[PDB]
Design a protein around this nucleic acid. Structure first.
Ligand SMILES: [Zn+2]
Ligand SMILES: [Zn+2]
Ligand SMILES: [Zn+2]
Ligand SMILES: [Zn+2]
Lengths: 73, 73
DNA sequence: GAGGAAATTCCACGAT
DNA sequence: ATCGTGGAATTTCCTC
């Protein structure tokens, strides 16, 4: 019943300091390692869920950071 | 003329009835025969330009239709 | 020449 | 680390 704090999909455990699913954990790692320039086509307010998380890496990454995800955790 | 009526990128000609670039031509063909399930993570006003057009297929497809693109043209 | 469309290449995403 | 899937976009080939 525990949910990913980023996309609300069911969580696989505590990854990089935050309860998250597998895809969001892999996304965050790749985002930090690659130092990605992401641009929201919206207002930087996008809905991030299982379906929509692919739409805006910018808002997804922002949510990762604001939830406290860090590589050195 | 030039300037694709969907994303404002340089237009390659009149495709499916509308002045469009090459990428919006094949996008529309894919989307119109496909499901076009697309969900917007924003307010369905997403900015569609050369940089952001990949972010929201929902809004891109909506702009294709509003511009008047159709298969039977 | 135009434009439709397959073929091709590239990449994000995500499971294992 | 492979690696499958699917979308994106350019390149190549088709008919008219
Ligand atoms: Zn998640
Ligand atoms: Zn966004
Ligand atoms: Zn376009
Ligand atoms: Zn949108």
């Amino acid at each position: 019943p525990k949910l990913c704090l980023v996309c609300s999909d069911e969580a696989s455990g505590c990854h990089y300091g935050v309860l998250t699913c597998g895809s969001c954990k892999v996304f965050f790692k790749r985002a930090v390692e690659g130092q990605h320039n992401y641009l929201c086509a919206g207002r930087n307010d996008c809905i991030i869920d299982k379906i929509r998380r692919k739409n805006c890496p910018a808002c997804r990454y922002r949510k990762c950071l604001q939830a406290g995800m860090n590589l050195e955790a």
